[PDB]
Design a protein around this ligand. Structure first.
Ligand SMILES: C[C@]1(c2ccc(-c3nc4ccccc4c(=O)[nH]3)cc2)CNC(=O)N1
Ligand SMILES: C[C@]1(c2ccc(-c3nc4ccccc4c(=O)[nH]3)cc2)CNC(=O)N1
Ligand SMILES: [Zn+2]
Ligand SMILES: [Zn+2]
Lengths: 209, 208
């Protein structure tokens, strides 16, 4: 039941999503090993992801979490990179989309930094890079990220020196880098129904000049 | 310089062009937002586009490409949809017919799927639909597509879900990498590498 609607580059909505992408690129401590070497993206397309059933699944869970957290959904827009983006937009998030060995427990991970999510587009650690060239820093092949609506509820704050259940009385974990002060937060949910894949962004990383 | 010659529905040439039009319809990931909801067309007319100057411009360029690519023009018949089909058939393709924001750069885009070109008849994203009813899925208004002769030469293969061609290439091929049912799309960067051979007038048909 999913349909994808192209946004025009002249639309404020497109422009706002692009600015969130570009403005949250940072340097990574791997020197680009996983996601490649770049300071900015070439945005090729931004689509709205429309699925009535997945939307209702999301809003029903958001309502439950909101009431449990004293009428506060604590809803965010966050990036998600994955080799299973095509499955996610059609079937929704579920246990198959978790990062079992993630530092804040076995759940589904999201980032404030677009460039953090870019590290997972070709798998954990960037896998072997793009299919065609086996290049984690490929400037040719098209990549996709999701920009998702995520319900955090009561979030457990975990400072970090950079499917499971949530901490008791918590609906998510907030992983907050405490050493690199330019690194933004990462977030973990333990129920697929707490995220909706609202935008599908197609892009290339750009070689610095 | 352009004249349009009507083909009879009994002509084998009409029949072969209609079959390519109908047989290359697919479902689109927008659920019909841009192009409308349909599985087939009502073909109203097919006309041959005859212009001596435009044809000679095409064949001159085709020979240049062929000579740069081991005597192989790599010539295809592909669909083109555009709000400017009337300018195209009278004056030829040029930089004003390019899709500046296309996924493979600013060039002139063609499709194997007739239904992909149908999404552009009323503009990028289907614009605001037909002039009369403002409906992207209008079943009443007459639409036009071009079925064009296109020189690809050495084509750059882009896997995926006016500028210049990549150096050492004469076109780009957009290979579909997600939708298993999509056919290829193609971009040229010189208007002289396409000739608008057939003008097809049609309606999209409402599914039963
Ligand atoms: C599903 C998959 C996986 C792993 C990690 C991510 C991922 N991990 C992150 C970790 C931190 C911040 C963002 C992300 C992010 O956007 N995506 C996504 C998918 C791929 N293989 C696997 O075992 N787990
Ligand atoms: C001239 C125009 C335009 C844009 C895209 C197309 C077009 N784009 C395609 C993209 C992929 C496949 C086919 C086509 C196709 O048949 N036509 C045609 C005209 C219309 N407005 C504009 O700025 N560029
Ligand atoms: Zn590549
Ligand atoms: Zn109409």
């Amino acid at each position: 039941g999913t349909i994808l609607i192209d946004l025009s580059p002249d639309d404020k909505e497109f422009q706002s999503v692009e600015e969130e992408m570009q403005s949250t690129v940072r340097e990574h401590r791997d020197g680009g090993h996983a996601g490649g070497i770049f300071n900015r993206y070439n945005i090729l397309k931004i689509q709205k992801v429309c699925n009535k059933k997945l939307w209702e699944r999301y809003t029903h869970r958001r309502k439950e979490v909101s009431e449990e957290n004293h009428n506060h959904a604590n809803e965010r827009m966050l990036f998600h990179g994955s080799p299973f983006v095509n499955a996610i937009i059609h079937k929704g998030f579920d246990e198959r989309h978790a990062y079992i060995g993630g530092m804040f427990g076995a759940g589904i991970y999201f980032a404030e930094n677009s460039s953090k999510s870019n590290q997972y587009v070709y798998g954990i650690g960037g896998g072997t890079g793009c299919p065609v060239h086996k290049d984690r820093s490929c400037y040719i092949c098209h990549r996709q990220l999701l920009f998702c609506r995520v319900t955090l509820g009561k979030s457990f704050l975990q400072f970090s020196a950079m499917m499971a259940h949530s901490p008791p009385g918590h609906h998510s974990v907030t992983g907050r880098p405490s050493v690199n002060g330019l690194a933004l937060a990462e977030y973990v949910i333990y129920r697929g129904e707490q995220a909706y894949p609202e935008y599908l962004i197609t892009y290339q990383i750009m070689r610095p000049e």
